[PDB]
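Record format v2
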Amino acid sequence: SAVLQSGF
Amino acid sequence: SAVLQSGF
Amino acid sequence: SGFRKMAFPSGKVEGCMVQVTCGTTTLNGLWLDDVVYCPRHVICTSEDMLNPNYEDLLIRKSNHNFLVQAGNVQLRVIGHSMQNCVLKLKVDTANPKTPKYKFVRIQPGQTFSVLACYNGSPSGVYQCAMRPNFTIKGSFLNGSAGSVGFNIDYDCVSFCYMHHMELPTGVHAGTDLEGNFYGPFVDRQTAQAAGTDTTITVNVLAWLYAAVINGDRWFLNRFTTTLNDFNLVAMKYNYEPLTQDHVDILGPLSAQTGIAVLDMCASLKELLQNGMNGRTILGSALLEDEFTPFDVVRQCSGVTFQ
Amino acid sequence: SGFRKMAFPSGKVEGCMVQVTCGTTTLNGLWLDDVVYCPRHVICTSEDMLNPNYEDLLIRKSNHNFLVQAGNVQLRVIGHSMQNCVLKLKVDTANPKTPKYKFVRIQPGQTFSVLACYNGSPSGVYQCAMRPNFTIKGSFLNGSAGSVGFNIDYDCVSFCYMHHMELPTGVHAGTDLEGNFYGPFVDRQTAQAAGTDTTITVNVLAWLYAAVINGDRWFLNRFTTTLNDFNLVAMKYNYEPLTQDHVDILGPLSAQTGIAVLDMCASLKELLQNGMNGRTILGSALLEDEFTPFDVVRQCSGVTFQ
């Protein structure tokens, strides 16, 4: 899938 | 030759 | 002499980057005047990201749920709203480092610089091109969403790209600064197909002209061709077809070097069929398509900015 | 994912660039505190450049012969001296945007970013490496002398290069910020030749580790090799021999990927003896040697700077 590249 | 790269 | 993949100086953009946190989700924001722009998926948890309903997610979000940090400076959010795929955070302090800027939507084939950031802090700058399938071949990790692409013209910074996500094939997709995606993509963690990537032919020709300007002439043959005959060969190697408007754009580079565009097309057609036979062009063993005709003129004539 | 030739953010350096004019000769200077650093050949006319007597040429100059501009603001020169091949101009205004900085002399194989400048204004930023023959493969035109190369280390900017001249092969030469040339070159327009440009083997290995990290693994084989046998092959292809120190340096990259350094050497040894079969690695058709092991870690782990 596409991956949303925010951080945690 | 080498060329000194100042400007005019 | 010389030719490098050159990026714009990033100083004017660095002073606009901030960190945006909502819960445990952090990414980068763009702070201009009293507004912070950031990808709207900052409001997601890791579980919301497969099938997010952003209107539902906004119901339990208030101003004080967004934490915005400009380095040591804290910014108080006094409003927020969703505009397409970005959030606009109204903050209590106008950015004193705000440059003269515009929001521009770029088209496939054009280039820009990317300032990759993590936790609102700059990591590096590099130059890329918007691919014909509306992706970019960037360098992004988790936490880089909200990094921006830009051009500089005279005194004005032109923002054209905001980073959101990575596609399974290792390429990247984002929005303009109005929040509208480049290409047929959506901001959710689903399988999404991009179109076939093709080689930007006019850019390859401009880079061949840059080669001649810097003294690389070994690939100039005696042949010429026509637009139709070239495009017949080009379409088989996944090259964008060349049009008459592309020929016109290359005019000044052709006049400067004294090599007619259709003669350069004949040299390109031979490089396609026969390869480079162990030689290199401008230090490259592949044909480079991430320099526009304007990029070449700019680097080879020393254009500077304010 | 992705891997790009990334430069450091240039903002801390853009604020230090000024224009230095002496008579009809102009170049760039570096403004740190109340001192401007620039190449000493600013005091040459066209006639002086074949065999300049810098001591005699400098004794005929006064402070008012140097015009120093920071944008539109003019800075008056209140003192001048020569330190090796660099002039130091004491000015009346200390630069308020002076960053924390260090002067460092680098070694061949190390990388740094260049902010190319003309007339005191930034043109572009790009990454390069000090070649084993003490040149760099840059992009410089007349007027660019005084442009600097730098690394960013947490909060401290490390200046390592100031541009002076171009050699007849299209490669470039300069000094550290104390005025000492890299390599056996002198600042006069005589015939000077660069030595052998060998390939930086430890950098190619780190780049191959970057490829694995990014999913490019087709070149990995089940073979291993010794340092002795690899070096016998590598000396034949003008690669630098590998030492135990290089093995230690690749330690963390080897540990992250699970590929032992000597297994990766066996893979590289095969790529030299057989070529790349038309395949590409990280979008390149040549083995890339301008990324250090630290460059790779910094890009693949998202290291940011203040």
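The longest strand of chain D covers residues 156-166.
Chain D touches chain C through 53 residues (CB under 8 Å).
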